[PDB]
Design a protein around this ligand. Sequence first.
Ligand SMILES: Nc1ncnc2c1ncn2[C@@H]1O[C@H](COP(=O)(O)OP(=O)(O)OP(=O)(O)O)[C@@H](O)[C@H]1O
Lengths: 224, 194
Amino acid sequence: KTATAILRRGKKRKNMNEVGYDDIGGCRKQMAQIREMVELPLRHPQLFKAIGIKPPRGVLMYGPPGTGKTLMARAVANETGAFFFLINGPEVMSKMAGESESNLRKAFEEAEKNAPAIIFIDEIDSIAPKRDKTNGEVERRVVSQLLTLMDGMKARSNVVVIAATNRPNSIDPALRRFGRFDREVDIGIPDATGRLEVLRIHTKNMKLADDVDLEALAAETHGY
Amino acid sequence: SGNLEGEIDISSYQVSTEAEALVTADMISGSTFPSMAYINDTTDERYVPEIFYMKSNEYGITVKENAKPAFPVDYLLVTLTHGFPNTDTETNSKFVSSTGFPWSNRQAMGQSQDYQELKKYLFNVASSGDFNLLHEKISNFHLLLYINSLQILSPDEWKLLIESAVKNEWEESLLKLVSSAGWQTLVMILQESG
Ligand SMILES: Nc1ncnc2c1ncn2[C@@H]1O[C@H](COP(=O)(O)OP(=O)(O)OP(=O)(O)O)[C@@H](O)[C@H]1O
């Protein structure tokens, strides 16, 4: 009812830039939540000024790998049409000592400089694991830099941070407080209708034979 | 520039391969302090990351200091060593010259290349003989460039002239040149010119 009130209505404002809402299936509720948290603060920022609140920014998606977290983030970013800065966990962590912090600093600085922006920190568990797993001093410098950049952003507004991870506990607890990744979204395995939608999405360019029963495959595939 | 004692010593340098790759993407500019070079901003075309310059302290530890405002240029240099050939006469030089016919565009001073200077420099040797004297007067880099610019001699004549002036075996080539029609016209007009 009200929950999916944002989903109701060329395409994609008209590579990996072509992903859109039509390339996703079986996650109506989570997609509604993500869109309600991302589009409204950026596309229509005057609603919250009119009602007199500061919308939350940090969004933390998590679920089993393969559930489409990166797909959802990229689709939302491409549909919003806002300055989209993509940070990869391993890509930042592969840099030399002292560069993996400067990269984060410049990333946030650029995202703040430009127009309404979205920062997607894919695989945040790589750059901010639980303290017991943060072996070494560079693993602590990076976490502290992430925390400082997150804290210093709350004033700027018109910039939303999205993070994805496999498990809620895999992240440093200090990142899940007020003014940080406070709103949390959970992606679960799809149901029969979701699996049918995914199957239709993927098998739209194949030379399928006429004797294909995608409903049967949807019924058989459980836990996929 | 001059050495510590007050002389006219000469020094040779060469910028590193990263300064060479830094200037191409702008990213550097001169600063009012002679020893330090400025850094530009992240405009919409050129994107400058954070620049660190690494140095080792007296305790043998490398220290990285952020230098956005300005950093010394001593990290962008490598020093060569100059010198002169030993007094032993090897005579591998290509020219017994650099003292005579005026050099390139020094019109500010009285050094103005013109037909009168040729008539006074490279005419008495060409009016007497002494092929050795003519060869040592013809082996001047700037004289060769000037006569080329005169365009009186045809390309083959100038090729044989340069190979007569720069090659260790020049007797036959020098004789061919002095006997060549182009050289004869050149010397005739030079004599006629005053
Ligand atoms: N509705 C859907 N849900 C999930 N995946 C989908 C869906 N529709 C298509 N796919 C495809 O499934 C794969 C999902 O890969 P994806 O990178 O999104 O997974 P992920 O584990 O969430 O990501 P990552 O670990 O990179 O953050 C891609 O091939 C995507 O094209």
